[PDB]
Amino acid sequence: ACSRIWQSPRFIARKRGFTVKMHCYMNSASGNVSWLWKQEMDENPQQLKLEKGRMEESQNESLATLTIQGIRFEDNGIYFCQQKCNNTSEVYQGCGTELRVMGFSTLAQLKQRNTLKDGIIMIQTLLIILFIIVPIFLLL
Amino acid sequence: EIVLTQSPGTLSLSPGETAIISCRTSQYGSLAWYQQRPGQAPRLVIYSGSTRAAGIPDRFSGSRWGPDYNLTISNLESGDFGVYYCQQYEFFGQGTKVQVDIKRTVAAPSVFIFPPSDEQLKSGTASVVCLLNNFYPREAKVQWKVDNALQSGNSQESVTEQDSKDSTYSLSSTLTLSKADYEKHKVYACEVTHQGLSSPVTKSFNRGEC
Amino acid sequence: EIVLTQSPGTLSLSPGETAIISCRTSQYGSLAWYQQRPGQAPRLVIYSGSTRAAGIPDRFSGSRWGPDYNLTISNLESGDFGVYYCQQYEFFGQGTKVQVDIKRTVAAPSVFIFPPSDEQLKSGTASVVCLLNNFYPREAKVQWKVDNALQSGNSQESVTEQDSKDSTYSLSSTLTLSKADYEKHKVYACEVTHQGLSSPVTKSFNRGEC
Amino acid sequence: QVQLVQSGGQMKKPGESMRISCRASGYEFIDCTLNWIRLAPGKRPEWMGWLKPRGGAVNYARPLQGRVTMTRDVYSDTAFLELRSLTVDDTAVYFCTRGKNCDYNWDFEHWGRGTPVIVSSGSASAPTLFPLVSCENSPSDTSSVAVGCLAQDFLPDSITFSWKYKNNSDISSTRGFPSVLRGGKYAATSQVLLPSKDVMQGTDEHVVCKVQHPNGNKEKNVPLPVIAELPPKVSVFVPPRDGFFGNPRKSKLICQATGFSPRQIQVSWLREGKQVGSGVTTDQVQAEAKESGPTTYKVTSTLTIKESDWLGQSMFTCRVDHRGLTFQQNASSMCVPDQDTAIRVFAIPPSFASIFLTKSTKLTCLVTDLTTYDSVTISWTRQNGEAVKTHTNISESHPNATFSAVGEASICEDDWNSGERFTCTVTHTDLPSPLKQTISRPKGVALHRPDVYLLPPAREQLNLRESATITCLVTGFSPADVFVQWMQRGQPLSPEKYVTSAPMPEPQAPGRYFAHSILTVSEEEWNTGETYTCVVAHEALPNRVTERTVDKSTEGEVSADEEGFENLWATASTFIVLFLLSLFYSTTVTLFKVK
Amino acid sequence: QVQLVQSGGQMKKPGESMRISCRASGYEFIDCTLNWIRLAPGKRPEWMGWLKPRGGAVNYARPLQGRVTMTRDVYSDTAFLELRSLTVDDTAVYFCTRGKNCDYNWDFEHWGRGTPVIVSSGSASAPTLFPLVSCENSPSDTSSVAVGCLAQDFLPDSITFSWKYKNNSDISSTRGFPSVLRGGKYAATSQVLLPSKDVMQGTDEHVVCKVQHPNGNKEKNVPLPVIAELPPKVSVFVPPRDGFFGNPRKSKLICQATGFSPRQIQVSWLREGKQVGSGVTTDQVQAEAKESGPTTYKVTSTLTIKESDWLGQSMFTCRVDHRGLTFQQNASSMCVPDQDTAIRVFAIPPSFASIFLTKSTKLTCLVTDLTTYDSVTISWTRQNGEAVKTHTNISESHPNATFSAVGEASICEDDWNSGERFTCTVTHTDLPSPLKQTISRPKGVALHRPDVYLLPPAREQLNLRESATITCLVTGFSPADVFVQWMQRGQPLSPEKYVTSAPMPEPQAPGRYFAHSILTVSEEEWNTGETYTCVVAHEALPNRVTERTVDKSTEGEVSADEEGFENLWATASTFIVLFLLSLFYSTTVTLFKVK
Amino acid sequence: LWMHKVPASLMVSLGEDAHFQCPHNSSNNANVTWWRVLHGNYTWPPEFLGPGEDPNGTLIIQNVNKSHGGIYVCRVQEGNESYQQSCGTYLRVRQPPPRPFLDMGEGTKNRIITAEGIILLFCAVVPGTLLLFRKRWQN
Numbered sequence A: 001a002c003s004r005i006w007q008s009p010r011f012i013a014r015k016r017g018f019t020v021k022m023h024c025y026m027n028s029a030s031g032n033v034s035w036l037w038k039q040e041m042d043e044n045p046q047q048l049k050l051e052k053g054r055m056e057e058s059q060n061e062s063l064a065t066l067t068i069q070g071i072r073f074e075d076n077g078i079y080f081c082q083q084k085c086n087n088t089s090e091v092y093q094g095c096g097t098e099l100r101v102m103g104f105s106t107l108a109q110l111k112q113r114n115t116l117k118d119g120i121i122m123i124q125t126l127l128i129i130l131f132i133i134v135p136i137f138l139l140l
Numbered sequence B, C: 001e002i003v004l005t006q007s008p009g010t011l012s013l014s015p016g017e018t019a020i021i022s023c024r025t026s027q028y029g030s031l032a033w034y035q036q037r038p039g040q041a042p043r044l045v046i047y048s049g050s051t052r053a054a055g056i057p058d059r060f061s062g063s064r065w066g067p068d069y070n071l072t073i074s075n076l077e078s079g080d081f082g083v084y085y086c087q088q089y090e091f092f093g094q095g096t097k098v099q100v101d102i103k104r105t106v107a108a109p110s111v112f113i114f115p116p117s118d119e120q121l122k123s124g125t126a127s128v129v130c131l132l133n134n135f136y137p138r139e140a141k142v143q144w145k146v147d148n149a150l151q152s153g154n155s156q157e158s159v160t161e162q163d164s165k166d167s168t169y170s171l172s173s174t175l176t177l178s179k180a181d182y183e184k185h186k187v188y189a190c191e192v193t194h195q196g197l198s199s200p201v202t203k204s205f206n207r208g209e210c
Numbered sequence D, E: 001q002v003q004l005v006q007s008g009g010q011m012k013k014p015g016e017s018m019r020i021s022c023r024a025s026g027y028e029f030i031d032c033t034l035n036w037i038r039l040a041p042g043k044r045p046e047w048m049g050w051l052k053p054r055g056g057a058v059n060y061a062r063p064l065q066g067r068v069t070m071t072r073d074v075y076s077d078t079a080f081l082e083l084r085s086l087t088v089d090d091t092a093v094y095f096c097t098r099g100k101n102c103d104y105n106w107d108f109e110h111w112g113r114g115t116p117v118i119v120s121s122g123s124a125s126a127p128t129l130f131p132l133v134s135c136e137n138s139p140s141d142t143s144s145v146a147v148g149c150l151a152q153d154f155l156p157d158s159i160t161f162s163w164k165y166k167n168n169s170d171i172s173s174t175r176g177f178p179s180v181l182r183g184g185k186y187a188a189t190s191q192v193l194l195p196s197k198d199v200m201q202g203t204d205e206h207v208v209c210k211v212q213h214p215n216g217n218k219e220k221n222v223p224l225p226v227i228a229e230l231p232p233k234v235s236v237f238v239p240p241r242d243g244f245f246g247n248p249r250k251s252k253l254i255c256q257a258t259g260f261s262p263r264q265i266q267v268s269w270l271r272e273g274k275q276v277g278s279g280v281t282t283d284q285v286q287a288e289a290k291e292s293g294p295t296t297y298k299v300t301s302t303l304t305i306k307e308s309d310w311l312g313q314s315m316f317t318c319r320v321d322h323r324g325l326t327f328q329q330n331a332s333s334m335c336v337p338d339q340d341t342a343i344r345v346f347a348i349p350p351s352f353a354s355i356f357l358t359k360s361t362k363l364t365c366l367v368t369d370l371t372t373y374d375s376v377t378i379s380w381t382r383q384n385g386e387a388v389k390t391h392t393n394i395s396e397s398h399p400n401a402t403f404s405a406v407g408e409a410s411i412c413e414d415d416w417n418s419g420e421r422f423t424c425t426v427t428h429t430d431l432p433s434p435l436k437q438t439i440s441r442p443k444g445v446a447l448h449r450p451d452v453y454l455l456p457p458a459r460e461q462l463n464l465r466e467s468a469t470i471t472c473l474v475t476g477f478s479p480a481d482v483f484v485q486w487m488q489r490g491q492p493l494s495p496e497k498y499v500t501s502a503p504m505p506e507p508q509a510p511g512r513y514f515a516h517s518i519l520t521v522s523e524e525e526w527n528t529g530e531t532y533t534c535v536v537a538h539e540a541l542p543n544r545v546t547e548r549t550v551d552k553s554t555e556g557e558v559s560a561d562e563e564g565f566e567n568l569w570a571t572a573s574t575f576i577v578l579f580l581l582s583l584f585y586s587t588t589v590t591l592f593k594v595k
Numbered sequence F: 001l002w003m004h005k006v007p008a009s010l011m012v013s014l015g016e017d018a019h020f021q022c023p024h025n026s027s028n029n030a031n032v033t034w035w036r037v038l039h040g041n042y043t044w045p046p047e048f049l050g051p052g053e054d055p056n057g058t059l060i061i062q063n064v065n066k067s068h069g070g071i072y073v074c075r076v077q078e079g080n081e082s083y084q085q086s087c088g089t090y091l092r093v094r095q096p097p098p099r100p101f102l103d104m105g106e107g108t109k110n111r112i113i114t115a116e117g118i119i120l121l122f123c124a125v126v127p128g129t130l131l132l133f134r135k136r137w138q139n
């Protein structure tokens, strides 16, 4: 008995810092799951990059899950759940859970900070040209 | 029971009318008619079919048409009433009962019906009676009707002597059946037809529901 | 049917016992007794009241006391069994049947009773049976009692031959009555008396409630 | 000159023999042949045979062969006829006939006077009498009732019919019928017409029919036809609610009809006014045993009904017709036992809202179904029977068709808290028994104080600039009475601006409840920094009241790292400002120092 | 030396004549007189007459006169006897006897061997078989039951009796009886004693009695003397409120007893412990009309009851005792009077979600507060009175000591949507009237597309110990129904974890409703990245379904890299250090003592 | 097997055009139908959105706005066998911010601010003390 694997969330978008969970409703007595990672939609390597700190994967005998506590921007990608079913030599695979970590600083704050930074940069460039020009004319 | 048949079983005629009696014989042989007065011996009136005997008045005359012979008297008299029977060799007919009938107004026969008694049915057979009292013109056609099935043979008619005062006859037809055959029907009727009615009477009764 | 009447219709006695037959005549004339064996012709035993016939053994002797005549045999034998009839002039008595009776222990006759059948009662008359089987003593007084009224004349008893093995007889009393008179009583009983019963049997039945 | 002389009549008996002589004169005896003819009444003439005087040749009929003997004397010119083994059927008149001419002996013109022979004329068999009753009730002017008596199994022909009443009065209106022979026995019938008034009013229930025969007279009573007319009493019976049994639960109804006179009755069962004939069982009609009076009759009809049908209020009718008169009776599961005056009375207890607002626990016995308000009295009786001062006001118009009134009495708080017995008595002159209603609240329900959490409007909601919805969630109060009311500035918002939910059980913890309240604020009264206080009152709270405040800018998204980010940017901005100002100061000072 | 020699036996026929010779030797024939004596079985000897050889003088008996003729031959010394018109009664043994001496002819000492004469036939009537059954069940120790078979109307006397079982097994315990002549016909009876165990255990309901006769074999079934056994109870019948009008306020009560095989019963009426024999009329116990099966009977009993004690509710118990057991019944009570009515009837309409999901429109009528379940009947009727099919279901005997029942009917969506009215009708034996309800669809409604907002538990009030509570607020939907579902990890959560409230109306926004749905979590799984959705399905939605989501984090619209997170610390630190450097350079500037 | 290869999300702005694809490898006659399913093991039927327009079942949603967020799924089916279903393409919507200066990244802005700070400090310190020494040396 080898039922089809399906993986619960298709898209997660959280701010950095918060944990994230991905559930893979496998088949029970067919094999141990193993998650994979894929930064784009081309080809996926094994994510044995699970640090003992952040990534940790478990198995509740009908639901396997992976939690990433500290979400940082270098965690974007698609996470699969390839399980080596033991009735034949093939392996099933759930289809993807795209994690795109968001960030702080809502749109209004972003606009305000952009205007202020632009003003600061223009002022500093003006001072640069002013301070480079004034002594030379003064020391004629 | 014989080859000679006398259809005139009864004759209610008045003095002056013509009485017709027929006798059909289905065998070769001379036919003779004899008249038997009450108490007296029979007397030969017509011999050899149409030849009158000695002392026979010219009023009586016989005729032969093939196998049927008719003896008709053109003038009823006091001494002309009696019992008339036809004779053929050693076989004689049933006889004709000619009796006087006093003329009167046509009456209506009050038709009734009598179901079998409970005691009568318990012991043997059952009898169905149908009385028609105070009826003029003794000729009457009373036909028993059981579930609209005209019976024939099991009926028995009986006519009383003409009343001296009222000049009315009473006829009763007693239909006798068996206890094992009377339970197959419940609608029993006696169709009585006469000159005094317009349509034949159908006084009926239903067994069980009385 | 005649003036001469024989008391004992049947006699069940063993070889060695004394058989007494009585016959009372109500007319003047010599009384004679004849014994008829099964199949053989009757043989004269006693003539002129008490005069023995030729070849008659001294065991059989007749006695006369006025109008009553009694023939008594002092020694039952194989050839003494048969039918004994008394004759007076041209009139003969009903006869006396002497039959062997094997001795056995006195038993109790099972008294039974049978009411009229539903089919029998509906068509004609009705018969009330009274069975008394397994009886050692042949003699029995089975008297029909309907509503405590002793019946006499309408009863009819019947006794079968003694059983070869059990040496027991069976008595059946069939009471024949009419359907129009049997419904007037409901308490019907057959008083059966025998030597094997301390008191007479009163096996009764109630009509309707069965 | 030809004449035949016969011997005299003879009366013979069965088994004997008869001899008749026939002397001929006026002609040659040896010339013509003589024949014997016997005439039996009601039968055709029978010829016994012919005899030839010359030589003694005779020829007897086949039916009489072996029993008839013919002899003659030539010298005496007389013939003889001997008939042995005579029977009753041989009783007839024997006559001797001679032919008109010697060529044809069949034309018997000369006949003798005849010698009648009677053989056992007297009737032997006793007639059997069976009364005859009219079968059809003729409706065509039946002024006379016809009754009859039938006599059968009579031998020969000798019957005399006489009819007399119970008072020995002879009936002259008797009409008999001619005797009829069937199966060797004669059958006769006698009929008598009786007046209708005499039959109806006479005390004689039967007439005496007398038949006289030679073998013995017999009498048979003929019952008087036609009886009185009585109305059929009708009764209908039903089962109570305990009379049903079986898997398809069913019971019976009975229509028992008595007093229907003639012989007849019809009974029919109808369902809801429609004729039905399934399961109906009518017993055969039987007479009632009565020692006196006219013979009355009885009948009982049975109908089977399912309890589902019987309890469905459907009407069941027994329809009976008698002599053209139809009668019906109705039965159904109808009780309507109670009085229809003011009956429904509710004693509404004081809610917790009432105790928190009016500062007194009031009992309210409200009477409904009231039709008149001049004699009703409302009194409140405590557990010990003492009464307190009630108050009355009666509603008018038709709020619920009928009128109503209110009875109210104020009691101390501790009395209600202790849960003593309290009773309101309602009395009306139309009420034979004063209805009593009781109310009390002694219980052991625990006091778990609620928890009040106030939730601000969702951010997705405020983006639409339409309205905002504030929720005051109350959770975890053990008695199911709460009182929520909002507060804008210091005065309560009008109670049509919020809707408070009913207390519902809490799935997380059995034995505890929760309730919500919802206030709508129009997105600018929220955006201009106003405050809202949700004042919850409950039994288990410290001072029967609490209050939570939520007013626009309170707190929210925590995001500690986000606040670190904002503080870092603020630090960077302020230090950029200070650095730029320091450069301005340094440059101004050094250009002052150069100039 | 005197001996009489007779001829051999002869078999004659009825109507014929027989002749027998009697040769005499050893004595003078003309001296002694010879007589003829016939001896028939079962009858006394009869003397036919005496004949004198000298002169031929004879003297025949009166009964035999005319049919017997006596002749003799002097030379041959032989006598002759002729008997014409022989019949069946003439069959006997004819013997010639002579007196012992010539002086006395009556002393018949010498008799011939006898010549038997058999006259076959004459009546020719076959016997008729009539079954005989025991009339009395003897109370003695009868291990066998006696049965009989009576044969009657047998003209001759020759009958062989046989008994066979249903399996053609012959019965050896047969006892025959002697033939009895009654009215010119012989009657015989046969009895068979079968064991009681065989009759009570064998499947043969009757025994086959076979009688063999020369005129035809006859067979008749003999039923065993057994009957059915189960009769025992009765039913009571009350007349209605209208039925008490016998005169002043009187009627009769009827008790019916049926299903009785054995006749023996006793009928009685009781009233509060005393035997009642007043006004009691008991009918006969007649046979029920059954084609086949048990022969149970039926009887009705009647008491002329008074209404005065009926208003007093005096009891009436009708009892019978049958087969040693007493049955009981006592009619009373005012058609289950009131103060015992407690039934809840809920008519549940079909929601839109169920119609759109299961494609079936199932009206439901939930009935609770039942005390029993035998009589309850739930019927769904359409508006025009045409009843709709229903399927009741009784189960879940609750701890409240009540039973719950539901009757669900299915209808087409078209009729429900059109606004038709459907009426549940609950009837029960504990109710005085049917308990009707009505549901329909409010066709006059609009669609207004609700708005779903999902709310966090509490800013920091709930989230301090445990047990957070997230609400899914749904506001604005017009057609008064919704169905919210909660999901957690792609799987529906459980119907017993959240509580959704009824669509209450709103604060000031007339025409539309709102609802709620709270879910409770443990708060150890709320600050642990768990995500909950609230899927709300309403008719007016563009897709008839929607869903929202809250996990722990508000929202965000950046790519997590376009907000400059990785550089801000560097900027802040460098600006702090170079601001300090500028604050050291400004002093170096201002201090110069330039000439 | 063309499933598992569809994009896991589509990025689009409010009031813009959304193009989906169903890149099946069937026999160029299959009845493609586009649906809109819920999240996970739902219970409600999907919203039929119509066949593909023409080229390879492409779906064109126009004037995209906030109600159009959800999972979109084709159901290619050839002939009469059972359909084979794409995994889904979560469509997400937002309004893109504009930027006044030439948008110059964000971390690039911080780096340039720091670089200008350093340059400005040096161009302040050098000429200042240089010309303050020169004047004093001149004096």
Ligand SMILES: *[C@@H]1O[C@H](CO)[C@@H](O)[C@H](O)[C@H]1NC(C)=O
Pocket (backbone or CB within 6 Å): A032, A033
């Ligand atoms: C299956 O994978 C788990 C996860 O690493 C591992 O602990 C376990 O040993 C594996 N099973 C086998 C049989 O190696």
Ligand SMILES: *[C@@H]1O[C@H](CO)[C@@H](O)[C@H](O)[C@H]1NC(C)=O
Pocket (backbone or CB within 6 Å): D392, D393, D394, D406
């Ligand atoms: C009328 O009844 C109301 C309550 O229904 C009460 O408040 C008011 O006092 C009553 N009026 C009078 C005059 O009693």
Ligand SMILES: *[C@@H]1O[C@H](CO)[C@@H](O)[C@H](O)[C@H]1NC(C)=O
Pocket (backbone or CB within 6 Å): D344, D368, D369, D399, D400, D402, D404
């Ligand atoms: C009016 O309706 C019924 C009338 O029987 C009653 O039960 C109900 O309580 C009444 N309503 C009010 C508000 O009095």
Ligand SMILES: *[C@@H]1O[C@H](CO)[C@@H](O)[C@H](O)[C@H]1NC(C)=O
Pocket (backbone or CB within 6 Å): E391, E392, E393, E394, E395
């Ligand atoms: C009642 O419901 C039960 C399931 O609990 C079912 O087995 C039974 O068949 C139902 N009875 C009906 C529908 O009559």
Ligand SMILES: *[C@@H]1O[C@H](CO)[C@@H](O)[C@H](O)[C@H]1NC(C)=O
Pocket (backbone or CB within 6 Å): E368, E369, E398, E400, E402, E404
């Ligand atoms: C059980 O009965 C009680 C009242 O006795 C009632 O409140 C409760 O609702 C009933 N339980 C049900 C209907 O499930």
Ligand SMILES: *[C@@H]1O[C@H](CO)[C@@H](O)[C@H](O)[C@H]1NC(C)=O
Pocket (backbone or CB within 6 Å): F031, F032, F033
């Ligand atoms: C395409 O498939 C859908 C999905 O079942 C079906 O409803 C539709 O009728 C089909 N169209 C065709 C075969 O043209």
Ligand SMILES: *[C@@H]1O[C@H](CO)[C@@H](O)[C@H](O)[C@H]1NC(C)=O
Pocket (backbone or CB within 6 Å): A025, E491, E492, F041
């Ligand atoms: C979806 O939920 C139902 C609920 O019982 C479950 O039976 C079914 O197996 C679930 N489907 C999957 C694919 O897990």
Ligand SMILES: *[C@@H]1O[C@H](CO)[C@@H](O)[C@H](O)[C@H]1NC(C)=O
Pocket (backbone or CB within 6 Å): F021, F022, F023, F054, F055, F056, F057, F058
């Ligand atoms: C086929 O390929 C791609 C599928 O994504 C599509 O862009 C292209 O337009 C399609 N063309 C045809 C003709 O189907």
Ligand SMILES: *[C@@H]1O[C@H](CO)[C@@H](O)[C@H](O)[C@H]1NC(C)=O
Pocket (backbone or CB within 6 Å): F063, F064, F065, F066, F067
């Ligand atoms: C997009 O159009 C308007 C714009 O807000 C919106 O109300 C509507 O619900 C959206 N969907 C459609 C199909 O118009």
Ligand SMILES: *[C@@H]1O[C@H](CO)[C@@H](O)[C@H](O)[C@H]1NC(C)=O
Pocket (backbone or CB within 6 Å): F079, F080, F081
């Ligand atoms: C496809 O399957 C259906 C099953 O109903 C069948 O009727 C049809 O014929 C099949 N297609 C072909 C081309 O046979």
